[PDB]
Amino acid sequence: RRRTWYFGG
Amino acid sequence: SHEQFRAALQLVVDPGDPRSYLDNFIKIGEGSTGIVCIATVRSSGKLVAVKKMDLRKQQRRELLFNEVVIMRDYQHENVVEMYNSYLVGDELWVVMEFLEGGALTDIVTHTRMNEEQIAAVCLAVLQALSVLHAQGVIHRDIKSDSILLTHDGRVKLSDFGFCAQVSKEVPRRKSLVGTPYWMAPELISRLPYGPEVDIWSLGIMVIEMVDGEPPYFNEPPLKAMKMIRDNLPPRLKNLHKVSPSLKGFLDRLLVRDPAQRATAAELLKHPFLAKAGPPASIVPLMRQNR
Known part of the structure; x- marks a missing residue:
């Protein structure tokens, strides 16, 4: 998969 | 809301x-x-x-x-x-x-780039990064999908939706951000990190340009991340096909210790970049030409 993740902070 | x-x-x-x-x-x-x-x-x-x-x-x-x-x-x-x-x-x-030339992804998945072309991409990318990193901006999503081309082969960085700024008051970032296969090991470890993470992601993009795929691409995201976190830096599938110059270049990028990794500013002086062709040398790789 080429999708960007955002989870931090 | x-x-x-x-x-x-x-x-x-x-x-x-x-x-x-x-x-x-x-x-x-x-x-x-x-x-x-x-x-x-x-x-x-x-x-x-x-x-x-x-x-x-x-x-x-x-x-x-x-x-x-x-x-x-x-x-x-x-x-x-x-x-x-x-x-x-x-x-x-x-x-x-x-950028009528489309994304670098369409290229790496469909043809083989030679080293003149790889060096041209890396130089263009490193020029953007040297300037952004000098101002404390970290892109955080470097991969072929983020690199766009003009019809005459000029290379531009795009897709800044996930970027962050660092500065003397906020010297490092902590967010888990990126595309799993291209994420730096310190970022996956949840160590506070800086611009050095784009350098590691660029090294993974160099593997894209040589092998067509980042390492562990056949592994689910999480498993790929564990292996990036815990194993030695990933190897080219095709080590036999790259020059010593390109190999020594990659070895400055895929350094696990962010303190030992080359900066963009330093990589602009690496002898591998002397191979960089002009934008015209990229043109034949694009879908309308190949």
């Missing part, structure tokens, strides 16, 4: 609706934050690109302000030019330069 976020973005974008001057929207691409269309400027017939991002479909809404900060503050020859931003209904639209 959607309505609350719509009001905030409205204070930050340009007034108006660009449908008042654009015709013939044709979708050409999907991103992490939304879609990309070509549009025709009605007064002149010129082509522009329009990025459309639905405020309701975002992992984190407030990252949409990234596009405004970059547009307002961080323009450069190897960075996609952004012209204007608008709130249209529930969507942020950014009207931007149209």
Whole structure:
């Protein structure tokens, strides 16, 4: 998969 | 609260609706934050690109302000030019330069680049990064999908929706951000990190350009991340095909210890980049030519 993740902070 | 976020973005974008001057929207691409269309400027017939991002479909809404900060503050020859931003209904639209050559992804998945071409890409990318990193901006999503080309083979960095700033008061970032296969080991370990993470992601892009795929691409995301976190730096599938020069270059990028990894500024002096061809040398790789 080429999708960007955002989870931090 | 959607309505609350719509009001905030409205204070930050340009007034108006660009449908008042654009015709013939044709979708050409999907991103992490939304879609990309070509549009025709009605007064002149010129082509522009329009990025459309639905405020309701975002992992984190407030990252949409990234596009405004970059547009307002961080323009450069190897960075996609952004012209204007608008709130249209529930969507942020950014009207931007149209890179008619498409993404570097279409290339690496379909042909083999030679080292002149790889070096040309890396030089263009490192020029953008040296300037951005000197101003404390970290892209955080370097991969072939983020690199766009003009019809005459110029290379530009795009897709700044996930970027962050570091500075003397906030010297490092802590967010888990990126595309799993291209994420730096310290970022996956949740160590505070800095611009050095784009350098590691660029090394993974060099593996894309040589092998066609990042390492562990056949592994599910999480497993690939564990292996990046815990194993020695990943190896080219095709080590036998790269010059000693390209290999020594990659060894400056895929350094596990962020303190030992080369900076962009240092990599601009690496002898591997002396192979870099002009933009014309990239042209034959594009779909309309190969």
